[PDB]
Amino acid sequence: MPSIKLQSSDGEIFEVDVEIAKQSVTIKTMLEDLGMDDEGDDDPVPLPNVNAAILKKVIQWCTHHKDDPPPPEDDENKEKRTDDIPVWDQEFLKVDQGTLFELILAANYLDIKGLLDVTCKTVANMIKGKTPEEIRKTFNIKNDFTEEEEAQVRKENQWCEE
Amino acid sequence: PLTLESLPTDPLLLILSFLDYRDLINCCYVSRRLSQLSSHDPLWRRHCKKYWLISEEEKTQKNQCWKSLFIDTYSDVGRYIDHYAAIKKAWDDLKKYLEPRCPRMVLSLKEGAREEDLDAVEAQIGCKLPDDYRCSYRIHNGQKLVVPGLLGSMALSNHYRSEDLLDVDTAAGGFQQRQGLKYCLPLTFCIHTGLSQYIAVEAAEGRNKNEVFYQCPDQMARNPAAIDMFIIGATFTDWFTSYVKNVVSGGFPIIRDQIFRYVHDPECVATTGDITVSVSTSFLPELSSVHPPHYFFTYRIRIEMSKDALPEKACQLDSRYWRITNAKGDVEEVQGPGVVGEFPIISPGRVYEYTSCTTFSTTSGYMEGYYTFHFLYFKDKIFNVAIPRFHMACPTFRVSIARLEMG
């Protein structure tokens, strides 16, 4: 089986089937324009913006989606919802907020469309339909607004208010 | 140590793109970064091209940014936000299909009715109009009293029906609160006949709220409150969207530069030889009744010969054998020479369409039969043309609660 080496910032050398790792757009472009064209001597491809555990999780996710059908290339009026997440995708993402956010960062770095889409969907589902106090309690953001800024934003957005 | 605010601009924009409009406004109060990123103009593009159906061309004409378009629209038709996206989709479709078709009806349409007029209507009638009905009359106040109307028409040999959508003020003037038809509001008038496709602004007298029905009086009962109903659609949105789907799907044929309420089923085709027979059915609530059951129907037959056929196969109608069948299985037959007192010619290029009336005394019913053409050049030869077995159908009636309680 054709293979590739993905190296973490920690130093762990993971081995991924190249047909699996080609789901990530960045690795696909690298091994379609530079890597497999030259046939590099199986040197580890370093990925210094991710850590070991997050790389292991993206590898697990991508292996679980190695035979995934191509995504529907539709936007705007297609109205991408937040409930069509697969049940295994729902169960796999059940981690704390730090791991989920590092997974989103890894998904944006490797440009894995499916993983980024489902992680953004779960994060949106953690926000959709909650009061601002509920959002700031579920997450951890201090209110940087002053009284003047709070009054300004209230005056700007006092229209959805019923 | 890394939180949602610490995420980069692009994943945060992807996260906020999946949120709904109330959540995007709700994120404006959360933090300064989320407030800045919620006012991103593409973010109010999934929320404006679907909630108000405002396309790119409308934006370029109004030269406004997307969030400004959304706030300007929410300041106008905002409280109908969960209905507008449907109703305008009908209203901008009926006004589109009528643009190459009958142009006098859309030119008869008034502009939008402001909220002051609808509030005056609500104060006058003493009840609350349905929100979707308010949105639909906000997009268009209907039309002034001009024949033909917007909600279809029906033309017999003698009884001509044409119903035009009623404005807010005339609906308030024609609002009814009497016993029987209590808290019922008209959506159309006929002028010629007096049809009033009422809607129920309040659930009373055996009607669930926001239902659309015809007015069919009880001829047998002498109670003035005994009025029977002929329910058309579930709600106002269902009624209007079903009508618009029928109009733009070709289900309602365009005849005499009007919209006709001819429910034509594509199954009801019995083309024999080069003669193509096509039948369309319709219901008329003025000539129909419930007690006693009259259940009037009309039907138009589209007989024609294809131009591919040679002219030497020329034929002429001389008979109409009809197998009227009700829900009790009774069969009645007519054999009168010529359809509707006429002997038409079926020729290559000729299309004969005539209206006729039937009186199925039960709620169901169907017909079949033969024309038995006599050939033109060969005066002895006769062709056979079979009418398809088209199945009549009156809408779901509802006996008045005055009659239901009575006994």
Side-chain angles (χ1 to χ4, degrees):
Chain A
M1 203 68 205
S3 64
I4 201 60
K5 299 282 198 179
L6 287 193
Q7 190 175 5
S8 178
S9 193
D10 291 331
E12 268 82 2
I13 302 108
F14 285 74
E15 214 183 73
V16 193
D17 293 344
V18 68
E19 196 65 31
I20 286 165
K22 269 178 204 296
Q23 290 304 287
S24 48
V25 163
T26 284
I27 305 295
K28 176 202 275 183
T29 289
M30 181 205 172
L31 302 186
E32 199 175 359
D33 294 77
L34 189 151
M36 197 170 282
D37 296 331
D38 199 55
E39 283 100 11
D41 205 70
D42 63 272
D43 270 353
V45 177
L47 296 180
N49 216 358
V50 305
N51 59 75
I54 303 305
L55 181 53
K56 176 182 315 159
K57 290 196 84 64
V58 306
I59 282 157
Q60 181 178 1
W61 184 94
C62 184
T63 51
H64 184 272
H65 280 255
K66 68 176 175 64
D67 58 356
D68 195 72
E73 190 276 331
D74 280 325
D75 289 313
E76 284 325 291
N77 208 18
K78 181 54 71 74
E79 191 56 44
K80 297 192 287 284
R81 304 192 303 166
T82 50
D83 54 351
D84 70 316
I85 300 169
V87 296
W88 195 91
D89 276 348
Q90 291 187 8
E91 186 62 35
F92 163 66
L93 286 189
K94 187 67 57 203
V95 293
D96 46 350
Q97 299 172 0
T99 310
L100 187 43
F101 286 158
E102 278 207 339
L103 203 64
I104 295 169
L105 279 171
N108 197 24
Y109 177 81
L110 304 170
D111 207 353
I112 310 173
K113 183 53 190 202
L115 165 70
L116 181 58
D117 190 75
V118 300
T119 44
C120 281
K121 270 156 162 159
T122 60
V123 165
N125 267 337
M126 287 164 66
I127 300 179
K128 202 183 271 204
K130 283 179 171 61
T131 78
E133 288 90 2
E134 272 187 79
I135 281 167
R136 279 185 313 276
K137 184 174 181 178
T138 315
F139 294 77
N140 291 316
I141 294 93
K142 187 201 68 53
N143 258 324
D144 46 357
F145 287 167
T146 67
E147 267 77 16
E148 165 58 55
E149 303 172 357
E150 175 78 56
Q152 175 65 51
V153 70
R154 280 216 175 278
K155 179 199 62 190
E156 279 293 328
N157 298 270
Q158 198 261 329
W159 51 270
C160 163
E161 314 243 48
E162 168 256 344
Chain B
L2 188 152
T3 45
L4 184 67
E5 195 193 2
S6 45
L7 276 188
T9 308
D10 192 53
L12 210 49
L13 272 178
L14 204 53
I15 282 156
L16 288 191
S17 51
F18 296 125
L19 287 201
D20 217 359
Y21 81 107
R22 274 172 175 179
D23 304 283
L24 263 188
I25 297 300
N26 192 359
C27 291
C28 297
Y29 303 97
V30 175
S31 179
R32 181 193 329 267
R33 185 176 167 88
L34 277 174
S35 76
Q36 287 199 47
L37 277 162
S38 72
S39 293
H40 194 61
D41 274 331
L43 284 197
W44 300 96
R45 190 180 173 183
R46 191 198 303 269
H47 298 178
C48 195
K49 271 179 65 179
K50 192 257 287 189
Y51 272 39
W52 314 124
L53 307 159
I54 295 186
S55 174
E56 298 276 329
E57 305 283 352
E58 273 93 327
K59 175 188 183 293
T60 58
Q61 192 263 329
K62 222 182 292 202
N63 72 42
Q64 285 267 261
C65 56
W66 276 110
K67 179 167 202 179
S68 52
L69 262 175
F70 191 85
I71 178 57
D72 284 352
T73 315
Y74 196 88
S75 184
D76 182 65
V77 289
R79 71 168 269 140
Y80 325 113
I81 185 156
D82 55 355
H83 296 316
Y84 194 95
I87 296 299
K88 191 196 180 288
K89 186 178 197 202
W91 261 121
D92 205 46
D93 206 358
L94 184 140
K95 278 182 63 182
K96 265 175 65 176
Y97 181 80
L98 261 57
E99 189 68 30
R101 276 79 173 179
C102 308
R104 83 182 91 181
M105 313 164 46
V106 290
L107 284 167
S108 62
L109 277 167
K110 299 178 191 179
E111 276 299 323
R114 57 207 182 280
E115 300 269 327
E116 283 83 5
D117 308 333
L118 272 78
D119 284 325
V121 162
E122 277 187 353
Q124 184 174 337
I125 70 152
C127 297
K128 294 206 54 58
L129 308 169
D131 284 337
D132 49 356
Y133 162 79
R134 290 193 47 167
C135 168
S136 167
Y137 278 25
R138 187 82 192 275
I139 302 173
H140 272 75
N141 208 357
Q143 47 187 352
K144 56 194 83 69
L145 312 177
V146 173
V147 173
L150 202 62
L151 275 297
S153 300
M154 193 37 67
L156 210 47
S157 49
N158 195 15
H159 173 272
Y160 174 63
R161 179 166 68 97
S162 195
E163 43 187 356
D164 52 356
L165 194 152
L166 211 65
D167 60 82
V168 289
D169 207 7
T170 311
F175 174 73
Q176 302 193 181
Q177 68 270 37
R178 66 182 181 179
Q179 200 61 256
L181 289 173
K182 200 189 240 186
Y183 305 124
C184 311
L185 188 147
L187 302 176
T188 192
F189 210 54
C190 199
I191 306 162
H192 286 268
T193 54
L195 188 52
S196 48
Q197 191 162 168
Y198 288 129
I199 197 170
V201 301
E202 201 87 9
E205 296 289 315
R207 324 171 273 267
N208 45 3
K209 196 184 170 182
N210 317 329
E211 72 159 22
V212 177
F213 53 89
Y214 284 138
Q215 178 247 328
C216 171
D218 201 299
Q219 200 271 332
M220 180 48 223
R222 53 208 159 188
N223 209 13
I227 296 99
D228 310 339
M229 310 165 198
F230 264 108
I231 320 289
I232 296 300
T235 70
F236 189 94
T237 295
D238 170 49
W239 171 68
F240 192 57
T241 51
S242 299
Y243 175 71
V244 168
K245 268 162 222 177
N246 289 14
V247 165
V248 310
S249 67
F252 279 25
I254 296 90
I255 293 298
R256 298 168 36 188
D257 294 340
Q258 312 191 346
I259 297 304
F260 268 84
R261 281 189 175 278
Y262 278 129
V263 180
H264 164 230
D265 207 58
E267 190 183 3
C268 307
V269 173
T271 293
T272 309
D274 294 76
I275 305 166
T276 79
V277 64
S278 307
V279 59
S280 306
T281 64
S282 163
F283 181 80
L284 281 78
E286 295 89 27
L287 311 173
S288 78
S289 79
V290 180
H291 198 188
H294 213 80
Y295 296 139
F296 186 80
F297 286 105
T298 198
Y299 53 100
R300 261 184 59 244
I301 298 91
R302 195 202 153 81
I303 59 171
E304 83 196 7
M305 184 164 288
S306 85
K307 303 212 59 53
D308 291 331
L310 72 164
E312 289 74 12
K313 298 291 288 295
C315 63
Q316 166 164 233
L317 193 149
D318 73 273
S319 175
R320 33 179 278 198
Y321 171 80
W322 286 110
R323 259 190 282 271
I324 295 90
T325 314
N326 57 352
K328 292 183 176 68
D330 292 331
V331 178
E332 208 273 339
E333 294 175 352
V334 191
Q335 78 273 17
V339 285
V340 66
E342 200 57 33
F343 287 67
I345 306 282
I346 286 301
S347 183
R350 209 73 42 73
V351 185
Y352 190 62
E353 298 173 357
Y354 74 99
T355 316
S356 174
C357 64
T358 182
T359 316
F360 290 99
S361 174
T362 68
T363 178
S364 192
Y366 55 92
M367 276 184 284
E368 197 205 283
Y370 300 113
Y371 290 165
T372 314
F373 285 172
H374 78 269
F375 201 84
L376 271 156
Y377 319 125
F378 298 99
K379 274 80 175 173
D380 56 356
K381 184 167 67 176
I382 58 170
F383 290 166
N384 195 1
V385 171
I387 296 90
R389 189 179 176 180
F390 58 95
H391 192 74
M392 292 286 180
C394 68
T396 312
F397 51 80
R398 189 181 300 270
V399 177
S400 83
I401 196 155
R403 174 141 69 118
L404 288 174
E405 196 269 331
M406 244 9 119

